[PDB]
Design a protein around this ligand. Structure first.
Ligand SMILES: c1cc(-c2cnn3cc(-c4ccc(OCCN5CCCCC5)cc4)cnc23)ccn1
Length: 315
């Protein structure tokens, strides 16, 4: 509630602000001046959950995946915190499901394999999203999914929440990795049905439906889909299917005949030659630091500009 325009001084030196596109914090579309690439900037007012956005930043600095919304630049003033992120024009998965009522099994698989790829990578780095829901999955320009909102993420094996409808029965009991598998199971159901497996007007009724684990199985669901849903939506976390068995699951393997490529194609070590070749050893040393300043943003967007096919240049 300060309303200061001086906080935008450092930001406008690298980006051109446009319109507001997304929702607590405020999200605005912007254009990286040096590269010309479009970006999404999240703006948090420090006077208006601070440790929640601090959790997301710390995670996105260590996480880099083709199905995770990339963090380009972090800028903090005296009153605001700016987060320059990958721009996803396709919008929420949630909105896509509503517009299409429900997705076919084939359509779902294309989408779901990208979700599995992201979450498997997240778990491999010792993280757990803990808030998997269709609102937190965005389509990019190539209509591929990008996982967002790591504000509630945590390290299950580290030092010492989300939507109830996607919460694992263990979380309701008040008892980490297997929790995300459950949520993906809920996601799988919604994708192919268009509605939640567990839903109710009353909160206690809802949480009770979840812990029972009983849900309707629509007639349009194939037995293969039915089997996988059972394996993911096991009320007992120990009985729930592991990430490893999910990667090469028969349902997943259908029409593809190869396991989900969860490995990150977005490295920290290997730098691009064309992107570096500008303005060598001194330049590469600066990029490898990854301070997530203007340099990190410039390089990653220059690499994105290169992956787009556009000329590796700076306006
Ligand atoms: C991290 C990242 C983001 C974010 C990054 N890109 N991004 C993009 C959007 C967004 C982009 C475009 C939008 O318009 C949707 C238009 N729809 C698209 C579907 C077909 C009909 C027309 C709606 C939302 C929203 N949030 C983000 C938001 C919050 N936290």
């Amino acid at each position: 509630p300060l309303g200061s325009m001086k906080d935008y001084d450092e930001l406008l030196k690298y980006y051109e602000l446009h319109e507001t596109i997304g929702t607590f914090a405020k999200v605005k579309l912007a254009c990286h001046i040096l590269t010309g690439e479009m970006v999404a900037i999240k703006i948090m007012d420090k006077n208006t959950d601070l440790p929640r956005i601090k959790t997301e930043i710390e995670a996105l600095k260590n996480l880099r995946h083709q199905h995770i919304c990339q963090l380009y630049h972090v800028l903090e003033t005296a009153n605001k915190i700016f987060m320059v992120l990958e721009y996803c024009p396709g919008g929420e998965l949630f909105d896509y499901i509503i517009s299409q009522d429900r997705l076919s099994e084939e359509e779902t698989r294309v989408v779901f394999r990208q979700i599995v790829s992201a979450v498997a990578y997240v778990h491999s780095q010792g993280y757990a999203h803990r808030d998997l829901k269709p609102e937190n999955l965005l389509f990019d320009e190539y209509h591929k999914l990008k996982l967002i909102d790591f504000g509630l993420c945590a390290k299950p094996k580290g030092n010492k929440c989300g939507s109830l409808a996607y919460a694992a029965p263990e979380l309701i009991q008040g008892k980490g990795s297997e929790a995300d598998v459950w949520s993906m199971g809920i996601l799988l159901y919604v994708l192919m049905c268009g509605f939640l497996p567990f839903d109710d007007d009353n909160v206690m009724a809802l949480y009770k439906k979840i812990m029972r684990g009983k849900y309707d199985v629509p007639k349009w669901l194939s037995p293969s889909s039915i089997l996988l849903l059972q394996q993911m939506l096991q009320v007992d976390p120990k009985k729930r299917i592991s990430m490893k068995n999910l990667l090469n699951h028969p349902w997943i393997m259908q029409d593809y005949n190869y396991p989900v490529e969860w490995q990150s194609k977005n490295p920290f070590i290997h730098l691009d030659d064309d992107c570096v070749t500008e303005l060598r050893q001194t330049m590469e040393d600066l990029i490898s630091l990854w301070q997530y300043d203007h340099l990190t943003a410039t390089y990653l967007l220059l690499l994105a500009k290169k992956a787009r096919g556009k000329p590796v240049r700076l306006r």
